[PDB]
Amino acid sequence: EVRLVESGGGLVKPGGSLRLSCSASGFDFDNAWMTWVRQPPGKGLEWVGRITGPGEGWSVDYAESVKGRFTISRDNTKNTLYLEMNNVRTEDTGYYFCARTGKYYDFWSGYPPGEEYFQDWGQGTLVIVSSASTKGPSVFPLAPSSKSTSGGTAALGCLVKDYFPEPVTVSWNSGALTSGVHTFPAVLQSSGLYSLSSVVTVPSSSLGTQTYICNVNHKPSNTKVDKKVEPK
Amino acid sequence: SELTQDPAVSVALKQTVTITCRGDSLRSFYASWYQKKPGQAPVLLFYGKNNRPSGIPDRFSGSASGNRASLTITGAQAEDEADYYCSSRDKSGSRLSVFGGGTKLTVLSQPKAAPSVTLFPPSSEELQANKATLVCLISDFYPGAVTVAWKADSSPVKAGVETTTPSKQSNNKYAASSYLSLTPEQWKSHRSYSCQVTHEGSTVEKTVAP
């Protein structure tokens, strides 16, 4: 019956402020310790901070990476935990989770109160830190070459650089070419802008004859780019 | 980075796998362990000396010896494929907590498979825009975990690198991509750059030159 639900994620610019909320039910929130954890894109879980109960005076501790910039607080009348994110940095991008927290102890085995553990978690809320506004992609060919070819198969593609926000969609030959196509997930770069690539593996015999065109759609910028990709 | 874990391990069905975190604070503290699947909240699997929350299958067990905390899955099952994180104190006398880097556990459905690697140099067109991106595309590998190392000449390059998490392609095998951003002068000033992909302790290195 324990439920944790984070809210407030969204886009914020470096130096900006954002407040996240975590609503709780199904347990005694008043006396529960509550922790914030985050996960950057493609990275591991990182401990952000924890707020104790009234026995410890609602004491708060913070990871050195956020100390002085984030503030954790709670409003027990609403069963809500908050994370006030200030002076945000690109490195704060990620999913933020709240977790009902216990402190491990075992009188029988003489283990004194020790490490904390995270008994129940919400699904997280996404924060994206970027100074960017809408920005269409630049598209460059990944031209097929002796280096991109292994005998009878050649790789070619399109590099879609420095756009914002997501999403970009890529087709090949207006959707007529799907076999051997992989469009990769975007990378959010330190710049606050996205880049991705689309690759197609095709018959090397076909390179002289067949046209290969990547169709890049970035609807947020109202941009479409078609790039015919040929050998160099 | 006070708790360190190998980034990837694989296990065959019904076999036993141990995922281990190493840290100085683990000599004095037990560690708790968490399972994380894409799109899902982390779940607490085990903590303390011998505590397994209700609902967690008993094939997960935590142990500790020296500076190592270990989660052993005795008889892996397909649904155990997940990232696994440990957590403990960063240090004795600390009110802070820390997580290990995470271990991706693949539960093999298949024999392992080596990657194919294609490295594209910057296009002349991108250089004309005063930019330069090397694109290292990696395909067909299993388990879906690789390590990517870039080099300028023979010297490791860590700045300017962005790498995607492997994801399945339309053919059900994994692909990943890595990017090295350089200035056009950096690209032209070296003899070569290289993209080295390590998978199951074997490596494939592609090299390009301006």
Side-chain angles (χ1 to χ4, degrees), chain A residues 1-146 148-218 220-223 225-227 229-231, chain B residues 1-94 96-210:
Chain A
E1 289 53 77
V2 170
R3 319 274 153 181
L4 300 173
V5 166
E6 303 87 344
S7 160
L11 168 60
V12 289
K13 319 190 235 208
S17 317
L18 187 64
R19 180 201 299 251
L20 306 187
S21 294
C22 158
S23 301
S25 309
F27 65 96
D28 178 22
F29 186 78
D30 298 322
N31 295 316
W33 289 24
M34 292 302 300
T35 297
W36 284 102
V37 179
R38 66 186 182 183
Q39 192 163 41
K43 225 62 82 173
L45 302 180
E46 187 188 5
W47 181 80
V48 175
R50 177 257 27 260
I51 187 149
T52 63
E56 301 76 24
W58 320 112
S59 58
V60 187
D61 287 304
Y62 298 93
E64 174 99 330
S65 59
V66 305
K67 64 183 271 333
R69 310 188 297 100
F70 298 0
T71 295
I72 294 177
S73 76
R74 60 200 295 164
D75 180 352
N76 310 322
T77 78
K78 288 86 208 182
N79 291 45
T80 54
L81 170 80
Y82 297 123
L83 179 64
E84 266 167 289
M85 286 166 84
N86 304 313
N87 192 222
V88 294
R89 313 201 227 231
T90 62
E91 312 106 295
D92 305 327
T93 299
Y95 269 109
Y96 282 75
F97 301 90
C98 62
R100 187 169 156 219
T101 302
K103 184 150 155 123
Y104 183 72
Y105 66 80
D106 184 356
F107 177 96
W108 179 268
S109 70
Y111 193 91
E115 73 281 0
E116 284 163 50
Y117 57 104
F118 308 114
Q119 51 269 47
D120 298 274
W121 296 64
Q123 305 314 32
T125 185
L126 175 65
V127 176
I128 306 171
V129 184
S130 166
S131 66
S133 36
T134 306
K135 184 190 182 313
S138 295
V139 180
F140 300 109
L142 298 174
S145 79
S146 49
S148 75
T149 74
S150 192
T153 299
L156 60 98
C158 279
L159 175 63
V160 184
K161 290 295 290 323
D162 300 330
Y163 64 85
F164 193 90
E166 288 266 50
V168 157
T169 63
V170 182
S171 66
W172 286 89
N173 294 349
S174 301
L177 169 56
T178 56
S179 84
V181 174
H182 182 76
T183 296
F184 289 83
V187 177
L188 191 300
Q189 303 161 129
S190 67
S191 54
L193 300 172
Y194 295 93
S195 295
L196 66 70
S197 285
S198 190
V199 70
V200 63
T201 166
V202 309
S204 69
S205 55
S206 190
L207 296 184
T209 44
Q210 169 75 46
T211 296
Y212 296 105
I213 295 156
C214 67
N215 329 96
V216 181
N217 277 98
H218 183 238
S221 68
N222 269 324
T223 295
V225 178
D226 295 315
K227 176 71 65 162
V229 179
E230 41 202 7
Chain B
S1 188
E2 278 152 68
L3 303 182
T4 63
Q5 311 183 226
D6 294 341
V9 196
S10 61
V11 64
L13 287 168
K14 294 306 281 181
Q15 229 56 53
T16 295
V17 58
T18 305
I19 297 172
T20 306
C21 295
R22 146 183 148 210
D24 294 325
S25 76
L26 299 181
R27 285 187 189 300
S28 292
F29 302 93
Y30 297 121
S32 54
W33 287 95
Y34 304 85
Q35 189 187 70
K36 171 91 170 68
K37 294 186 184 183
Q40 300 206 324
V43 178
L44 170 65
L45 300 168
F46 208 90
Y47 64 101
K49 173 203 164 202
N50 69 329
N51 306 70
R52 173 193 38 51
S54 76
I56 301 305
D58 52 27
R59 69 185 175 274
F60 296 91
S61 185
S63 55
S65 183
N67 70 339
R68 304 168 280 110
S70 279
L71 175 73
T72 300
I73 306 167
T74 302
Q77 301 185 6
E79 67 263 24
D80 302 337
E81 175 162 310
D83 292 320
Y84 287 87
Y85 297 90
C86 55
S87 176
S88 192
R89 291 291 177 216
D90 61 326
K91 284 199 60 44
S92 295
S94 193
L96 311 190
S97 305
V98 65
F99 287 92
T103 296
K104 163 143 208 223
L105 181 77
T106 294
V107 178
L108 300 171
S109 44
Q110 177 171 336
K112 301 179 175 162
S116 156
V117 179
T118 78
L119 180 55
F120 292 97
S123 61
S124 59
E125 273 190 67
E126 183 187 20
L127 290 167
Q128 288 306 300
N130 201 39
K131 303 286 198 113
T133 310
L134 316 165
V135 185
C136 187
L137 296 179
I138 312 153
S139 70
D140 290 333
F141 49 94
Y142 184 75
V146 289
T147 303
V148 183
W150 288 90
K151 297 150 186 55
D153 282 307
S154 318
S155 325
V157 190
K158 285 168 193 170
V161 174
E162 294 285 349
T163 68
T164 55
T165 63
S167 72
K168 272 177 187 94
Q169 322 167 243
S170 54
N171 70 320
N172 199 35
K173 302 239 91 163
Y174 283 94
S177 62
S178 189
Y179 298 101
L180 175 51
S181 293
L182 288 170
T183 71
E185 51 90 0
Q186 283 175 326
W187 165 239
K188 296 301 195 71
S189 58
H190 275 57
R191 298 177 217 71
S192 75
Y193 283 78
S194 291
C195 176
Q196 183 196 253
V197 180
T198 298
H199 180 266
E200 300 283 325
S202 281
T203 69
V204 172
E205 178 158 328
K206 288 308 220 272
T207 299
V208 290

